[PDB]
Design a protein around this nucleic acid. Structure first.
Ligand SMILES: [K+]
Ligand SMILES: [K+]
Ligand SMILES: [K+]
Ligand SMILES: [K+]
Ligand SMILES: [K+]
Ligand SMILES: [K+]
Ligand SMILES: [K+]
Ligand SMILES: [K+]
Ligand SMILES: [K+]
Ligand SMILES: [K+]
Ligand SMILES: [K+]
Ligand SMILES: [K+]
Ligand SMILES: [K+]
Ligand SMILES: [Mg+2]
Ligand SMILES: [Mg+2]
Length: 1318
RNA sequence: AUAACUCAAUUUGUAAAAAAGUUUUAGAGCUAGAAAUAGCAAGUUAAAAUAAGGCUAGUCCGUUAUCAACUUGAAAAAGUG
DNA sequence: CAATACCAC
DNA sequence: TGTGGTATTG
DNA sequence: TTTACAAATTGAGTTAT
């Protein structure tokens, strides 16, 4: 009797019930509650609206940061425990004063001066040590016994702010000496062509505060007859961090583009050194050494022969220059600009020195402020130099200290300990302990050190006791933990669900993959009458001769190095492989290079050992654990080999297990899968065939070996948590609708699923791409990540400022004249992304518009596209489409594919929704044990209904109201059921469950013509076989028109408790305001500042009494109280106690109503409001604009055929221009009844009259904006032409306390209305 | 529709770490003047907190997901037009 | 208790 | 961005 | 801001049920 249509979005689920005749029924629904109304008429169409579901990322970032704060605190507690006994003899309360430093003097229990407890000593300390780095350096370099309090503060400061762990190993690299070392190993290889590095100040040039590319050119400028792209220049450039290409240096064909920071350099070098010899390993090792000193020179800035605290010394240099430069700047301003001294040095709000030190000005904002002040004045030459080096008036706690590795704080910590352990025995005994505090990290592969109460933890303990930094290796089972880290995430073999999947790089796995591909190769020669498989002997010979001697095996090699050499074929045709084999024996060749013993690799006896080695190399990343794991095999290899085996690392897992591949055996033959791949008579069955062949027992054993709530099922799907929220809501809507129809199931369910920060990532692509390109375009044309939101400007930079089709530069200032063009035309592929788009002077030069770009263009541009490809400025997908014309372009089969892809949904996520609905609706089986499909689940793409709306003028204008979501679902049901009714053969493509390309292209291109009267077709469409009427153009269109015109549509905004952060994170200064919230129990915000602006979890209706006046007379009240997220647990634990603590007395416990966000209230004249908060309301009504006005607006506005048709539409608009005044009138009466914003309505009416002179198109476009005044939800600002209309807010919830509260079903069809008059 | 492999891109989920920022206190402001006020000096650092907090007391947990109402019902979850 | 401006996120 | 909290203005 | 890891999914290809 009925079908359901569904429109699934990230913020909405539209739904509709339709009958045979495409009508949506209406029904009386009971109304519960305490009001007049007992029932209500409802149309069976509507839409559920909801806020977006969120990813877990923000939550994880706060969670992991929380753990760092508590562990950092524990670092300090460990330090103080070590100091405790001996500090007690020096200063009873030192650690107490530190802990209470934040407290106001009134609240302090000890003296207010932290370090020494009296003014005179506290003042003297700061005079001698103006920064902690003065103290640090003194304690590193001096031999005097030091005060234990100063020792503590120095150590704590290094342990609390300890630097990063991005460099492995130890650190102790002078650019001067390591530059000579580079020249030396260079002239030892090029006797005839030497470099004279005499007089060259390598120190000043390479450690200069400049951009790598410039320093390179500076250095090279001092070497005559040496260009920056020669070998030596490419070495220096490698040490500066650029991307040098040693290809042309060594006359290669494989591009040796190796950069030191890329984590594949280590293997990029051994790849290059395998091509120029091993005499160049000296040179490229000098290169990385020079890089290490250059990197360190950016941080240390001070000669290491004056101090063992180069870092602290560098901070002191910052302080000293800051001091000297400030004295000069003050002097200069006094003399020359006396009227500006106050602004610069006193006004905190003005980004001068005062705002920089006292206000909110960053280093960057401060430089911008005094830049013209320095330029204007005289005698500021060097201050301007330092400003452009970002080196003027620097603080020492700064955003760029993230560069500092922990090894250099450790170096100072260690030196202080060796200095002072001569006087304090406990520092000698605890030296290593203290060093371990700074140095220890929990490995990422161990996770939280939990004891059974963490849903995130996986680590296991070797013994039950508290873990410390010092007993970690003994208490934590690192091996078991590192293994669980991976194995809790990796797949089991689906065919043998108890078996672990093999490492991707397993030797056995790569044998399987090569043999599986090899067995389906066939060949033919002249004589033979038919292509033949390779035999077992031929496959073994090919593996031994080609795959075990070349990392890759090309078809040419197969023809020439096997068929010519072994079979004596001068010509042969190969069928199972293109260009080169996809599979390869990469690991075999990796280990051959490491162990240098082919016989060992080929000996079957060593198979178990080699699998275990690669497993260790895959499972673990830590070199120490790997080495420990490989020790059982130490006797089999040289110590040199073992050391290389350590460094070999692999990642990734296959999809099959060892047992499936080469363990389970066929009963009759006794052969494994791999056995069959190596030799299978003349049938050469591959893995798919073996596993499905009834004459073997593989299929039987897999069946034998085989072994979730609705919410769990959906949560586990792969997809955005945003769409997954719509999926769950869709299932619940369907459940309710089936119940509404008396538990009868629908005939059909038609589902359509809407198709599915970014600035930073765009800059990153271009920065690294242009650098990989060696281009200077970013220095000639600077950008900021915000400008890259312009599609044309982004493409300009992605194309290195060149035309993508012509091999010419473009002009940045002329992008408005240039074209953005789709590589594969958007008539075929509805791809809007950069991945299918291109910037070109004129799209004419693509070639023909009917296809991919022409061969001529591919020939001209392919090499330039290749560089973009290698720079990651274009993508492999984009390159393949750009070059498709040299592979035949778009065949007629390709075209037909694209057209049916526009109509047939293939997204996995939509199939999952269809599966879920299908398996919930269809549960019975027939006499052959086959599922009975009572309900057909149909999936359509949005284009079908979209084209339907346009061809028959059921236009969508989204901003008029939310009805379009529901109309979409109705149209889905109509078009979907009529489609399969007309063409039941199409069920295969649309219904869930189990030469010619021109006809197929024509078919899907004309699939919807049966709705039409001329393209000439009859008035009534029928199914050719059944003789059943599917569409009647004389009354079915009218019915659709009536549905879209219906005013009452069940739009329901999902009410939701608010969760997340307690409040705005801003830590505000102290204020005399009870809105301030304490940051800790005893931190009275009037003294300490705190938070404000908490988020309300939900509101609560309280009917109670409150004390009034001095005498505290009890007065009855009825009000909404907002329960904040922080207050929620306390309020729900005991509501009455919570409320009485707020001041309420004699609360009517049974009358408390929980009111989450968006709770719906109706007042007078159908006026409705939604709860945004405890103190603010949203608009609750929908403006049901008649269809004739919606269609007029779509046409007049040019919101989105033949010229005559366009002329007819244009004449319709002109003949109906009086609709403008009527639409305004409709907005006015709605607003006067429901919006109650008369200042803004008066503004609007005034503005509408102001522009009645404007063209119709423009007035239509701007009337579209006026509906934000009337839209459901939060008031929002909008513009009518050039007048801005500011939002009118509903800043009181009082009126709602005497209105009718409306509780709504998910569909809104079931209501209970509560009259709050009480 | 499905499976293995190749290449590339994207998305989701987890762990371990860095640097800032902010907040209160500590870095004796000095003169003139009864007073506000004026003139000058000065500034770069540190401690502590970084969701209030919780019990399960761990170097753990605290911002995702899920949520009309009513009848039951401790609660889970059923039922209701 | 309006218009309303600014703020974080 | 959008939108609910806040102090300001009156 | 950085490092380490797993899983789908899309989509151009080879072979199959
Ligand atoms: K005190
Ligand atoms: K030169
Ligand atoms: K500042
Ligand atoms: K500040
Ligand atoms: K600071
Ligand atoms: K291939
Ligand atoms: K590994
Ligand atoms: K050995
Ligand atoms: K939530
Ligand atoms: K939320
Ligand atoms: K990720
Ligand atoms: K609801
Ligand atoms: K907000
Ligand atoms: Mg805490
Ligand atoms: Mg700080």
């Amino acid at each position: 009797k009925y079908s359901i249509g569904l429109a699934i979005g990230t913020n909405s689920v539209g739904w509709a019930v339709i009958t045979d005749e495409y009508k949506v029924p209406s029904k009386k629904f009971k109304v519960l509650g305490n009001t007049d109304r007992h029932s209500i008429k409802k149309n069976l169409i509507g839409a559920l609206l909801f806020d977006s579901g969120e990813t877990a990322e923000a939550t994880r970032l706060k969670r992991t940061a929380r753990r760092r704060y508590t562990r950092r605190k524990n670092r300090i507690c460990y330090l103080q425990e070590i100091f405790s006994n001996e500090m007690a003899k020096v200063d009873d309360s030192f650690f107490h004063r530190l802990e209470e430093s934040f407290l106001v003097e009134e609240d302090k229990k000890h003296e207010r001066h932290p370090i020494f407890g009296n003014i005179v000593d506290e003042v003297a300390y700061h005079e001698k040590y103006p920064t902690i780095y003065h103290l640090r350096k003194k304690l590193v370099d001096s031999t005097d016994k030091a005060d234990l309090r100063l020792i503590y503060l120095a150590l704590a400061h290094m342990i609390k702010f300890r630097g990063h762990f991005l460099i492995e190993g130890d650190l102790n690299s002078d650019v001067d000496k390591l530059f000579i070392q580079l020249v030396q190993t260079y002239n030892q290889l090029f006797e005839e062509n030497p470099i004279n590095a005499s007089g060259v100040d390598a120190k000043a040039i390479l450690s200069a505060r400049l951009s790598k590319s410039r320093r390179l050119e500076n250095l090279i400028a001092q070497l005559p007859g040496e260009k920056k792209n020669g070998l030596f220049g490419n070495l220096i450039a490698l040490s500066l961090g650029l991307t040098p290409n040693f290809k042309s240096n060594f006359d290669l064909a494989e591009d040796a583009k190796l950069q030191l920071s890329k984590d594949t350099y280590d293997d990029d070098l051994d790849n290059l050194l395998a091509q120029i010899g091993d005499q160049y390993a000296d040179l490229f090792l000098a290169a990385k050494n020079l890089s290490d000193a250059i990197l360190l020179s950016d941080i240390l800035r001070v000669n290491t022969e004056i101090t063992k605290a180069p870092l602290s010394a560098s901070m002191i240099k910052r302080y000293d220059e800051h001091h000297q430069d400030l004295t000069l700047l003050k002097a200069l301003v006094r003399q020359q600009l006396p009227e500006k001294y106050k602004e610069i040095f006193f006004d905190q709000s003005k980004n001068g020195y005062a705002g920089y030190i006292d206000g909110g000005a960053s280093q960057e904002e401060f430089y911008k402020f005094i830049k013209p002040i320095l330029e204007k004045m005289d005698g500021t030459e060097e201050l301007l130099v330092k400003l452009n080096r970002e080196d003027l008036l620097r603080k020492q706690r700064t955003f760029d200290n993230g560069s500092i590795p922990h090894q250099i704080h450790l170096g100072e910590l260690h030196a202080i300990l060796r200095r002072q352990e001569d006087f304090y025995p406990f520092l000698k005994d605890n030296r290593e302990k203290i060093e371990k505090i700074l140095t220890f990290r929990i490995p990422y592969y161990v996770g939280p050190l939990a004891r059974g109460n963490s849903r995130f933890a996986w680590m296991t303990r070797k013994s039950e006791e508290t873990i410390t930094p010092w007993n970690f290796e003994e208490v934590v089972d690192k091996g078991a933990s590192a293994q669980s880290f991976i194995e809790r995430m990796t797949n089991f073999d689906k065919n043998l669900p108890n078996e672990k999947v093999l490492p991707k790089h397993s030797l056995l796995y790569e044998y399987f993959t090569v043999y599986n591909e090899l067995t389906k190769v066939k060949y033919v020669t002249e004589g033979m009458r038919k292509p033949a498989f390779l035999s077992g002997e031929q496959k073994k010979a090919i593996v031994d001769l080609l795959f075990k001697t070349n990392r890759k095996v090309t078809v040419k090699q197969l023809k020439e190095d096997y068929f010519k050499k072994i079979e004596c074929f001068d010509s042969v045709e190969i069928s199972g492989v293109e260009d080169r084999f996809n599979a390869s024996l990469g690991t075999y060749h990796d280990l051959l290079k490491i162990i240098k013993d082919k016989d060992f690799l080929d000996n079957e006896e060593n198979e178990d050992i080699l699998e275990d080695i690669v497993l260790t190399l895959t499972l673990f990343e830590d070199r120490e654990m790997i080495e420990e794991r490989l020790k059982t095999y130490a006797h089999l290899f040289d110590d040199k080999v073992m050391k290389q085996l350590k460094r070999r690392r692999y990642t990734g897992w296959g999809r099959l297990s060892r047992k499936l591949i080469n363990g389970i055996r066929d009963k009759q033959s006794g052969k494994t899968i791999l056995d069959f791949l190596k030799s299978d008579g003349f049938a050469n069955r591959n893995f798919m065939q073996l596993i499905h062949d009834d004459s073997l027992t593989f299929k039987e054993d897999i069946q034998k070996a085989q072994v979730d709530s609705l919410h769990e099922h959906i949560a586990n799907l792969a997809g955005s948590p945003a769409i997954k929220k719509g999926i769950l809501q869709t299932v619940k809507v369907v459940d309710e609708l089936v119940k509404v129809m008396g538990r009868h199931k629908p005939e059909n369910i038609v589902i359509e699923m809407a198709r599915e920060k970014n600035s930073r990532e765009r800059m990153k692509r271009i920065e690294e791409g242009i650098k990989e390109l060696g281009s200077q375009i970013l220095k000639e044309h600077p950008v900021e990540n915000t400008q890259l939101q312009n599609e044309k400007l982004y493409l300009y930079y992605l194309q290195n400022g060149r035309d993508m089709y012509v091999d010419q530069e473009l002009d940045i200032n002329r992008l408005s004249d240039y074209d953005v063009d789709a590589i594969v035309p958007q008539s075929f592929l509805k791809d809007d992304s950069i991945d299918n788009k291109v910037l070109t002077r004129s799209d004419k030069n693509r070639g023909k518009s009917d296809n991919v770009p022409s061969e001529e263009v591919v020939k001209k541009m392919k090499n330039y596209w290749r560089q973009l490809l290698n720079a990651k400025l274009i993508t492999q997908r984009k390159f393949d489409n750009l070059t498709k014309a040299e592979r035949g372009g778009l065949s007629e089969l390709d075209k037909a594919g694209f057209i049916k892809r526009q109509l047939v949904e293939t997204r996995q996520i939509t199939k999952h929704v269809a599966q879920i609905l299908d398996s919930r609706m269809n549960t019975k089986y027939d006499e052959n044990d086959k599922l009975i499909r009572e309900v057909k689940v149909i999936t359509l793409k949005s284009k079908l209904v979209s084209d339907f709306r346009k061809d028959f003028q059921f236009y969508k204008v989204r901003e008029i109201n939310n009805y379009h979501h529901a109309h979409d679902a109705y149209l889905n049901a109509v078009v979907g059921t009529a489609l399969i009714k007309k063409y039941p053969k199409l069920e295969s493509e649309f219904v869930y469950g189990d030469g010619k390309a021109t006809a197929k292209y024509f078919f899907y291109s004309n699939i919807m013509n049966f709705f039409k009267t001329e393209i000439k077709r009859p008035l009534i469409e029928t199914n050719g076989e059944t003789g059943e009427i599917v569409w009647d153009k004389g009354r079915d269109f009218a019915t659709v028109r009536k549905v879209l015109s219906m005013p009452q549509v069940n739009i329901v905004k999902k009410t939701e408790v608010q969760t997340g952060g307690f409040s705005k994170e801003s830590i505000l200064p102290k204020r005399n305001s009870d809105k301030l919230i304490a940051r800790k129990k005893d931190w009275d915000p009037k003294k300490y500042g705190g938070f404000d602006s908490p988020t309300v979890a939900y509101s609560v209706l309280v009917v109670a009494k409150v004390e009034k006046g001095k005498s505290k007379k009890l007065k009855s009240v009825k009000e909404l109280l907002g329960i904040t997220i922080m207050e929620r647990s306390s309020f729900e634990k005991n509501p009455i106690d919570f409320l009485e603590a707020k001041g309420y007395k004699e609360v009517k416990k049974d009358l408390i109503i929980k009111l989450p966000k968006y709770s719906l209230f109706e007042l007078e004249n159908g006026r409705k409001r939604m709860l945004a908060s405890a103190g603010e309301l949203q608009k609750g009504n929908e403006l049901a604009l008649p269809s004739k006005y919606v269609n007029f607006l779509y046409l007049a506005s040019h919101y989105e055929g033949s010229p005559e048709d366009n002329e007819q539409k244009q004449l319709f608009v002109e003949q109906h221009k009086h609709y403008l005044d009527e639409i305004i009138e409709q907005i006015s009466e709605f607003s006067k009844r429901v919006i109650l914003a008369d200042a803004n309505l008066d503004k609007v009416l005034s503005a509408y009259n102001k522009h009645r002179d404007k063209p119709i198109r423009e007035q239509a476009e701007n009337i579209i904006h006026l509906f934000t005044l009337t839209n459901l939800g939060a008031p929002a600002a909008f513009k009518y032409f050039d007048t801005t209309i500011d939002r009118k807010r509903y800043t009181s919830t009082k009126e709602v306390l005497d209105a009718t509260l409306i509780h709504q079903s998910i569909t809104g069809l079931y209501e209970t209305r509560i009259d709050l008059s009480q």
